C-alpha cells in the first residue's frame, strides 16, 4: 500500500479498507498533508518512533474492532501481533515496536522465538498459533478444543474502554503456548509458583470520569472515613493511609488505590504527572495535592474494585513484619510490600 | 549525566535522583524514545529552544520542591539559577535561557555580572549569594542576619499553585544584592522612588477554576452589578467599565481584572488567546466574548484580590485628567493609566 | 504517481518511466530511504524547498533530454515549464518554483499571465504556445511558420554542458510571445531599445576544466602578458587590469573575464565562494588569491570567448568618462560600467 | 554504551574501544555536536535511516579490520551480522538494516531464520555458526575441518579496497550453511544448477583511479581499437560496441565494461549518475558523454579484468540468436543477454 | 539585523555590509531559501549547532579580513571574540560557541572572566583589551607601548592559508592579559615553565597540495630514504619509522610528520579519516595505506618544516629511555613521547 492510497483510505474510510484511489500528499516533519479540494490539510501527526509516512500507514491499518486492553498483553509479554496492528491511544502510537504481515517497511522477517499474539478473528490465526513456539491466541468465543482462561469483561474499542459490545457483554478467552507446548489451565490453583488464581482484574477507570461500581465504592465516595471504616469493619487495615491517603506532610502518605484519588478529587485538585504513558495495571505517578501542597515523586497507583481490595487485605493475617505478598492481577504476579502498617504496590 | 542515565532516572524516579542505570534511547526530532520492556515509548516531547537530548536532561533535573512563583523572579530580573533549574509548566520549558552548575552543555562559564537566584535549600547557596555582585537569595525561614522582605503566601509546586505545603502556610523570604551591596529593607516606605510598599501581590488564579477569596469577591460573583456597587459604595469608580466590562460595541470596554472575566464566564463564553505564555503579574490577551461577539486585541488583565483593587482606587483622589499612577505589584512598579474615567494597567 | 511507484521508477530506470511497481519507502528529514533486497538505502537527498516526498517525485520526472542552458531561460524570465520539469544540477533543485501538468501537489491551477516555456518535443506544446499570453517555445528544428531566433550551440544534458548531441551540433531555435502577440525577429538590429544583436553568448566553461576555444585564447594562456597584448594590438584596452587582474593590493583589481581566472589558476590557487549558485550569464564571486593573499568581495565574472570580448572593447571609442555600455549577452541586455580605464560587468 | 561515552570514544579513539569517559553532547537533526575544549564541533552527520544518536553509536562500533567486500555478502544475501557491524562507506551508512548483539536499540531479538554472517575473528563466531540454520562464516585462514571456498584477494579496509593487508596478500575463506546443513564445496563443477565455477570475481576499481592490471588491459588503454582487436584476435566479438562503446547516436551503444569507460575518460569526460549507491558486482548508471553529447538511461557496467571478459566471450560459440548466458561472478549467477551481436549484463 | 536583511546582504555583498534591503526567505530544516527573481534558491546550509536563521546571520557577519590561523587561538584558549565573529571553514561553522556584541540571539551578557580575543582593527578593541581580565589582542603592526610576541607569517583569509596579503608578508603581533595583568614577553627563555621559546610554528599545509618549503624538504621528496638520511647525517634519529613510516605490518609504524604522509602519497594512496575536524597544531587520524593494506587508529600527525623537526631531534641527546620532551609549537607546550627509538607527538 502506497502513501497516497493509504491517505486516500484514511480520509474516506477512517482506516485502511483496501479501496483504490489516491490523494496528493506531502510529508513535512511529523505532519502528513493531504490536498483535499485544492486545500492543504494535516491529516496525521506523527508521535511514533517510525518515519512519518510509515506511521500514517500503521495508524490507518490499526485495528478498529474491540480487543483486550493492552495492559494484559504487556503482562503476557507480547512482542508482535500476527497480521494486524494494535493502536495504543493512551500512548498515541502503535503497541508493538514491530509488525508481521502488515507493513512492508516494518515487518520482521523472523518471529520464530518472539511471543506472538494471534487474534481468532483473523483468517489463519488459529493454525498459525498452533504452529508457533511462543504465543497467545484470543477469541470472543470459548473454544472447547483449546485450554483457555477467560479475561475480564471489558475491551479497548478505538481507545474507549467498554464493558459491552453491541450492547452485549464483552467476552475474551485466552490460550497460551510457551516453548512449543500448550499451557494447560485448570479451574483451581495459582497461575504462577512461589517467587493468584488469575481472577483479579483492574477496573480501567479514569480519574476524570471515575464512577463507583458497587455499593461499597458508593459508600466510600459518600460517607466520611470514620463512617465507612466501621460499616465494613476495616479496623486494623489502615485505610486512612493506604486508601484515603494523608496530606498533612510534605510527602503524601499512602494513596495507592485509584478510588482513593477519586475521593480526594472531590474536595482537592490532584495533579498527576506520568512519565511512561501507556495502559498498565499499576501506574507510577508524581502526585501533587493542591489544597495541602503535599506531594510524592513515585506514587504507585492501581485501580482495583474496592470490594476486591478489601478481600485481599482480609486474606492477609498481617502478623508478620516486612512481608512481600504476591497478588496476581491482570494475569500477572505483582509484589505488594506489606509492613504491618502499610500495603503498597511495588514498582515492577 | 548521560542521556541513557537521565532517561533511566526520568522513567524510574520521575526526575534525576543520581541513581545508576541505563535505558536504550532514541532521539527523533523533539521526541525522546525509550525502549521499555522491548517496547518503544515517547517519554519526552521537546518544546524548548534546546537540543532534544539536552532538554530532557534539564526537565529531569527540574526542581520538584515548592518555590516562589516565577512571575516574581521575572519581576526581579533573574538571569540564571545557581545550581538548580526551574521548570516553567505554563511555558512548558525551563525558566532561564541558561544554567549554572547544572548541565555541562548549557552551563555558563561566567555569571559574575548576571542576576543570580540562590535558593537557601541548596548547600552553599548562602555563601555563594554573599559573594555575588547581583542576586536574590530565598529561604523558607526568616534569617535574622540578613535584611529580607517576605513574599506572598503561595508557591509553584510542580506547576501547581498552592497556598500551603504539607498543609502548612507557604512562607518565602527574599534577600537581594545589587552591585556588590545588600539591599536594606525597612518596614515602611516605597520599594522604588518616583518614576508601592511591595505588599500588593497578584492572586494567581486561573479562569477555568476561579474561586472568590473574600466576602466581597463572593458578592461580586453573586449579586447584580447595581447591588454590588451600592453595597460597597463604589459610586464614582466606574466599575461597570474597568471591572465588569462592557460588551455592547465591537471593541470590549474595560475588563482589566481577572475576577471580572470570571464573572462574565458565568453567562458568556470568553475565549482567550495569549501570545507570550508564561507566569506574569499582568497578562496581555486577545479576548473574544461569545454572546455579544465583541472583542479586543490587547486587553491587559491582572488578578488582584478585589478587596485590594478597591483600596487602590479609593486611595486615588481622581480629580486629575491623564494620570499615570504607579502601583507596586509582586515586587515591581507597574504603571496604571488613569483617565478620570478609566483605570487600566498599561503594557510594560 | 505515488511515492512507492516514483521510487520504484527512480531505482530501476533512473527517472520516471510510467512503469508499474513499488518499493517500500521511508521519508526521514530530507532523506528518502528505499528497502532494496531487505536492505535500507538512501536514494534521494532533498536540497529543494519542497517537501521531501514531493522533491523526489520532481527529480524523478526531471527532463533527461538535452535543452538550452538554464541561464537563457532566466534571462527570458521563464516562470514555469509547460508539462515538463527542468532540473538545475548546479542548484541541485528544480529550475522553476512551480510546475504545470507535472505534479499534483505542486501544479499551479492558473498560469495565464505567467511566462511559460513550451518545448516543441512535448505533444501539444506548439498549440499550447500559440494560445498563451506570454511564453517561449523552443525546438531543435527551425520552423518556417514561426518567427524564431537561434540560440548558441550548446545544451544542458543531465547537467553536462555539451556542444554536440549524438555527435551532431546542438541546435535550438527560440520563438517568443508577449501580451498575446508574437515577437517578430529580423536579421538585423538590436533586440532591445536604448535603456545588442542578440548574437553574443557566454561559453559555459568551468574553472576546473577551462579549455581555450580559439588561437587567441590559446595564446592568452601560453604567452606572457606583454607578448599577448602586442600580438593582438590591445594597447589602450587595459587588459592588465580587466582581464589579467592585479594582485598587488589588498583588493584584487579587475579580473572580470573567466579565462583570466583560468590563467591565474596556472600559477596561483584561486578560491571562489558563490552565494547564489545556479547557471547565470554573469557570476558574482567572493574571490581569494592564494599566492598574493589579495581578495575582492563582489567580483563579477563573465565567460566570454576572448575573441568576442576584444571585439566588444574595440567597438568602443573610449573617449568618454563614466560610460555605461549595454551589451546583449545570452538574449539579455547587461550594462557594463566603462570608465576610460576599466570595463567591468555590473551587478544586475 | 551511552551517547556521551560513545562520542568520547569516537573523539579519542576513532571508534568504540570500550574505554570510560564522557563528552557533553547535543543532537540536532542529523548532527551530533560535542563540546570539546568549551567549543562546539560536529563529530557526526547522520545519513542513515536510524535515529541520529543511534547512528553515531553504530558508526563508532563499525568494524575497522579488513573484511570481504560488501558486494559479496549482498550476493550471498546476508541479513545481519553476528556481534559486529559493517560500515558501507560508499553508502555512507551501515550495511545491514538490523544488528545482533551490538546495539541495544537496534538489536533483533530473533535471527533464527535470517542469513547470518559470522566472522571467525570474533570469539564464539564458529560455534554460533555451526548452530545456525542459515549463515556464512569467514576466516582469514583455511580451516581443514570445514568445507570452504576462497574469495578473491581483495578486502574492504575502512572503505579502502586493498589487495594486501600488512603488505601480505589478502586471504578470505568462506563456509556456508542453509536450512541446517553445511554446503559442501568441491574443486570442480558450477556453484548453481541451470536457471559458473565461482572463480570469476570483479576487480573493484574506481573510474577516477582506474589502473590496468594486465598487459592486455595496458594495451587496451594505449593501442588504437583496430590495433588492439587484431593483436588479440577479437574479430567477431564486437568489442567496438560492447567494450569500446559507440558515441555517434543520441543513445550510447554498448559500454558495459568498466575499463571501457576508463578508456573513454582519456579523451572525453563521462559523467555518471547512480541511484542505488552501494558496493555491487554490476552497476546501473545514467551515463552522459561530454564530447559527443550522447547518453543512456540504464547502462549496466561491470568491472571484470579484460582478460577474464575475453575468456568468457571466447567460450561462447555465438551461433545462437537471443541467448541468455549465465555467468557466476562474485559467487552469484548473473544472466548476460547475448544477441549474436551484443553481450550485455542484464539488470538483476 | 533581520533575517530578510541578512539574506539580502549575503546575496548582494557576500557578507553583512549593513546595507538596507530585503529578500523574501524561507527556513526549512538547515536550509535558508531566498526568492530571487521569482525563483527559490538555497543560499545557506546550516552545519552549525545554532538555529538555522541564527546561523546564516553569523555566517554573513563572518570576518572577511585576514587573521591568525584558528589553531593559535585554540592554543591560547580563546573563549569568545570581541565585536566580531570568526568563521572556521574547515569546521564549516563559527569558531567560538558564543558571541559578544555581534548577534542579539547569541551574544553573552557577561564575559568578564572569559578569555577574550580583541582585534586591533576593530574600533575600541585596544581600550576594551586593556580593561579586560583575560584576553589576547592582535594587531598587524607592532605596538611599542605593549609587550608583544610575533606570530608566524601566515594567515587565514576566507579559509585560505596565505603567506602574503596584498602581496606583502603577513604580520601579526600578539599581546596577552591574564588575571588583570599584562604578560611580559622578553627576547629569550621559554614561554612556559617545566611541566620552548615560542618560535616553532606549524606549516599549515594540506596533503592534497603539499609543497616542499626548503631544499631539505625538496630532497626528502625526491631522494631515496637511504640517500636522504646520509646527506643530512640523520643516522641514529630513526627517520625510517617516525618520518617515513613503515607499512609492513597490520599497524602502520611511525608516520607522525605531515611531509612523510606527503611522500607516501607519491606512490601509495593514503586515506585519512578525521573525527574532530577543525584547524589544530596536532591532528589525530585513522590512517589507511592502500598499497600495503596497513593502518593505524590514532595516528598523531604534525606539519613541521622538516628543517625544524631535525633541529628538534638533534637537540635531544637521546640517551634516556621513556622521555617526555616538551616542545612549544604555535605558542603551546605539547609533550612528545620519546623512547630511545621513537619520537611521536602525544594526544593532548
Amino acid at each position: 500500500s502506497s502513501l497516497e492510497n493509504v491517505v486516500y483510505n484514511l480520509v474516506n474510510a477512517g482506516h485502511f479498507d483496501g479501496r483504490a484511489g489516491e490523494l496528493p500528499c506531502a510529508v513535512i516533519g511529523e505532519k502528513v498533508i493531504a490536498k483535499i479540494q485544492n486545500e492543504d490539510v494535516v491529516v496525521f501527526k506523527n508521535n511514533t518512533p517510525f518515519p512519518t509516512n510509515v506511521a500514517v500507514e500503521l495508524f490507518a491499518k490499526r485495528s478498529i474492532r474491540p480487543h483486550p486492553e493492552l495492559k494484559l498483553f504487556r503482562n503476557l509479554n507480547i512482542d508482535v501481533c500476527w497480521s494486524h496492528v494494535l493502536w495504543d491511544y493512551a500512548k498515541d502510537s502503535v503497541f508493538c515496536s514491530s509488525t508481521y504481515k502488515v507493513c512492508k517497511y516494518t515487518d520482521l522477517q523472523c518471529i520464530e522465538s518472539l511471543n506472538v499474539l494471534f487474534d481468532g478473528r483473523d483468517n489463519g490465526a488459529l493454525e498459525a498459533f498452533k504452529k508457533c513456539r511462543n504465543g497467545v491466541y484470543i477469541n470472543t468465543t470459548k473454544i472447547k478444543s483449546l485450554s483457555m482462561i477467560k479475561g475480564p469483561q471489558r475491551a479497548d474499542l478505538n481507545g474507549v474502554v467498554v464493558e459491552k459490545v453491541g450492547d452485549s457483554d464483552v467476552e475474551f478467552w485466552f490460550a497460551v503456548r510457551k516453548d512449543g507446548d500448550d499451557v494447560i489451565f485448570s479451574r483451581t490453583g495459582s497461575l504462577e509458583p512461589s517467587h493468584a488464581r488469575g481472577t483479579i482484574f483492574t477496573q480501567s477507570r479514569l480519574l476524570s470520569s471515575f464512577t463507583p461500581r458497587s455499593e461499597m465504592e458508593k459508600d466510600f465516595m459518600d460517607l466520611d472515613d470514620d463512617v465507612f471504616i466501621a460499616k465494613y469493619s476495616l479496623q486494623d487495615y489502615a485505610f486512612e493511609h493506604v486508601v484515603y491517603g494523608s496530606f498533612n506532610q510534605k510527602i503524601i502518605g499512602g494513596l495507592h488505590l485509584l478510588i482513593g484519588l477519586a475521593r480526594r478529587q472531590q474536595k482537592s485538585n490532584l495533579v498527576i504527572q506520568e512519565f511512561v504513558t501507556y495502559d498498565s495495571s499499576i501506574h507510577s505517578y508524581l502526585i501533587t495535592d493542591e489544597n495541602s501542597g503535599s506531594s510524592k515523586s513515585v506514587c504507585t497507583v492501581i485501580d482495583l474494585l474496592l470490594d476486591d481490595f478489601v478481600d485481599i487485605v482480609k486474606s492477609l493475617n498481617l502478623k508478620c513484619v516486612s512481608k512481600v505478598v504476591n497478588v496476581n492481577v491482570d494475569f500477572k504476579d505483582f509484589q505488594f510490600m506489606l509492613w504491618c502498617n502499610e500495603e503498597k504496590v511495588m514498582t515492577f
Side-chain angles (χ1 to χ4, degrees), chain A residues 1-194 196-347:
Chain A
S1 64
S2 66
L3 177 64
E4 287 70 20
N5 178 65
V6 157
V7 168
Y8 175 81
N9 271 257
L10 194 64
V11 167
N12 297 106
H15 66 115
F16 194 76
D17 254 353
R19 65 182 54 183
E22 292 187 355
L23 243 51
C25 305
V27 178
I28 303 180
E30 59 182 60
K31 291 172 287 194
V32 171
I33 315 304
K35 193 171 297 294
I36 301 172
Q37 240 78 195
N38 227 68
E39 186 182 343
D40 298 325
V41 52
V42 181
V43 292
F44 181 80
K45 222 184 301 297
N46 182 26
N47 282 99
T48 81
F50 300 109
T52 299
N53 67 299
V54 167
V56 65
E57 180 190 327
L58 288 174
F59 170 71
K61 287 179 176 170
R62 71 191 186 293
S63 282
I64 47 97
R65 71 197 169 193
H67 58 77
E69 296 193 70
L70 301 181
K71 58 190 173 187
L72 297 181
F73 298 133
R74 292 199 170 90
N75 289 356
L76 293 171
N77 300 141
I78 277 47
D79 294 312
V80 60
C81 298
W82 188 82
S83 309
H84 69 299
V85 58
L86 296 169
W87 189 263
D88 191 330
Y89 289 95
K91 195 172 96 166
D92 187 35
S93 189
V94 177
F95 169 41
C96 301
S97 78
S98 290
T99 62
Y100 192 72
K101 276 185 165 66
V102 170
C103 167
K104 307 297 299 304
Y105 193 82
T106 60
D107 284 342
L108 291 172
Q109 317 166 63
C110 164
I111 46 71
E112 297 188 61
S113 72
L114 306 189
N115 243 64
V116 185
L117 172 66
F118 301 85
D119 189 306
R121 284 161 303 184
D122 295 310
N123 189 51
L126 185 53
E127 191 178 305
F129 171 67
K130 289 180 172 180
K131 289 177 165 295
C132 81
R133 179 187 311 171
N134 303 291
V136 176
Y137 169 90
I138 62 174
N139 204 311
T140 56
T141 280
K142 187 175 188 303
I143 300 173
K144 188 176 188 302
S145 56
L146 281 181
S147 182
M148 315 184 316
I149 188 174
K150 195 181 185 187
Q153 300 200 312
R154 31 187 165 281
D156 169 329
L157 174 58
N158 303 133
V160 187
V161 172
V162 305
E163 308 227 299
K164 296 196 178 60
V165 167
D167 218 54
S168 299
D169 293 317
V170 164
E171 168 174 44
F172 283 115
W173 287 88
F174 290 79
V176 186
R177 296 195 111 234
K178 283 206 166 303
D179 298 299
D181 302 315
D182 300 303
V183 171
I184 304 171
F185 298 105
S186 62
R187 312 193 184 187
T188 58
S190 56
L191 288 179
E192 297 175 48
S194 62
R197 320 185 313 179
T199 41
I200 302 288
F201 299 114
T202 51
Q203 295 301 310
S204 313
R205 295 169 285 191
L206 299 177
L207 195 288
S208 67
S209 60
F210 197 90
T211 305
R213 285 180 179 172
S214 72
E215 176 171 350
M216 189 193 280
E217 296 205 324
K218 208 191 66 173
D219 291 323
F220 184 82
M221 299 290 85
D222 304 318
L223 310 177
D224 306 324
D225 59 316
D226 51 305
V227 180
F228 175 81
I229 303 179
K231 181 188 177 79
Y232 295 96
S233 310
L234 299 176
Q235 314 322 307
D236 32 295
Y237 292 141
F239 263 46
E240 304 278 278
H241 184 73
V242 172
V243 178
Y244 281 104
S246 62
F247 304 90
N248 287 177
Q249 321 82 191
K250 294 178 61 177
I251 303 175
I252 296 175
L255 201 64
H256 297 281
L257 228 60
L258 186 54
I259 189 173
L261 287 68
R263 187 179 184 284
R264 178 65 182 181
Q265 203 76 186
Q266 283 180 156
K267 71 188 301 167
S268 178
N269 169 45
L270 277 183
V271 178
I272 309 291
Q273 290 180 70
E274 181 162 46
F275 309 94
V276 176
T277 66
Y278 57 44
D279 194 50
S280 62
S281 302
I282 283 71
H283 290 87
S284 187
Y285 305 136
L286 162 48
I287 305 175
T288 302
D289 180 71
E290 187 165 287
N291 287 6
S292 72
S294 181
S295 67
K296 198 190 301 188
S297 298
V298 180
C299 185
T300 52
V301 172
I302 182 173
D303 182 15
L304 293 181
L305 184 74
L306 192 61
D307 294 273
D308 284 308
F309 181 73
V310 58
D311 292 327
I312 295 289
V313 299
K314 302 186 71 65
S315 83
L316 300 171
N317 184 184
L318 183 56
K319 227 71 279 177
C320 200
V321 200
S322 169
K323 189 103 71 171
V324 54
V325 57
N326 278 298
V327 191
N328 193 282
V329 176
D330 299 326
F331 295 150
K332 181 181 177 54
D333 266 36
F334 290 96
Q335 59 184 190
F336 283 54
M337 183 58 86
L338 172 61
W339 295 84
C340 61
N341 303 291
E342 193 174 311
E343 171 72 310
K344 67 207 176 60
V345 51
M346 289 184 255
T347 310

